[PDB]
Write a protein that binds this ligand. Structure first.
Ligand SMILES: CC(=O)N[C@@H]1[C@@H](O)[C@H](O[C@@H]2O[C@H](CO)[C@@H](O[C@@H]3O[C@H](CO)[C@@H](O[C@@H]4O[C@H](CO)[C@@H](O[C@@H]5O[C@H](CO)[C@@H](O)[C@H](O)[C@H]5NC(C)=O)[C@H](O)[C@H]4NC(C)=O)[C@H](O)[C@H]3NC(C)=O)[C@H](O)[C@H]2NC(C)=O)[C@@H](CO)O[C@H]1O
Ligand SMILES: [Cl-]
Length: 183
């Protein structure tokens, strides 16, 4: 079960919460819930702005320059990818994570009607990629979206746990709720 072992959110969220003024700024800029941002901070770095994963996901929202970093630079009208030092900077890190969430909402996940389903799809896509999420429904992006829209948030989570090739995928939703409950 993707909820084992249990995940206590109180501390990660407490530390995440220290970044709220930045998350508010980033969120307002990109049309993203600052609590959604904070929960992602808590789950991914536990609020450590200097954290670097074994796969080079960097900073508070654990962005990978070669994937999310590139997509955000593209969205800004820029070439290339952000540096590791830029991704360690709290403001630049949160602003880019917020931008990535908006990119996901407006691109691959466009059309998802239920706000809770969309929230869940955003976190799973953020963590394991929109392409991977969509492929658990269809090879056609918008048929995938049509299928997602047949589901409620609980069914959506069930489908992810049942079909997603990465076991961690539904665990991100479990921790998401843990974090939201601590806030
Ligand atoms: C150690 C610690 O402190 N914490 C760790 C924690 O880091 C670990 O989790 C890690 O989290 C990060 C996210 O925060 C994971 O990063 C994910 O990884 C995804 C899979 O590679 C990645 O998905 C890819 O995103 C690309 C860019 O959007 C997609 O390509 C794009 O597709 C578009 C069409 O949909 C296309 O138009 C674009 O042109 C194209 N862009 C580019 C540049 O190619 C790509 O399709 C997609 N992959 C798939 C399969 O769908 C996410 O972007 C990325 N998110 C971010 C925000 O960077 C990271 O992988 C996690 N690590 C691991 C090992 O899983 C965690 C362990 O899980 O442990 C904690 O302790
Ligand atoms: Cl996949």
């Amino acid at each position: 079960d993707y909820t084992n072992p249990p995940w206590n959110a109180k501390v990660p969220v407490q530390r995440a919460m220290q970044w709220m003024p930045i998350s508010q700024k980033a969120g307002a800029a990109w049309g993203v819930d600052p609590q959604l941002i904070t929960a992602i901070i808590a789950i991914q770095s536990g609020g450590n702005p200097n954290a670097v994963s074994k796969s080079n996901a960097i900073g508070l929202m654990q962005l990978k320059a070669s994937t999310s970093g590139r997509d955000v630079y593209r969205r800004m009208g820029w070439s290339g990818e952000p540096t590791t030092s830029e991704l360690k900077n709290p403001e630049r890190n949160i602003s880019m994570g917020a931008a990535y969430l908006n990119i996901l909402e407006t691109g691959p996940l466009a059309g998802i009607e239920d706000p809770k389903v969309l929230q869940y799809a955003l976190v799973v896509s953020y963590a394991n990629g929109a392409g991977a999420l969509l492929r658990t429904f269809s090879s056609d992006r918008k048929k995938a979206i049509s299928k997602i829209n047949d589901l409620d948030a609980d069914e959506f989570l069930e489908h992810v746990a049942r079909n997603h090739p990465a076991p961690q995928a539904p665990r991100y939703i479990y921790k998401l709720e843990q974090a939201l409950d601590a806030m």
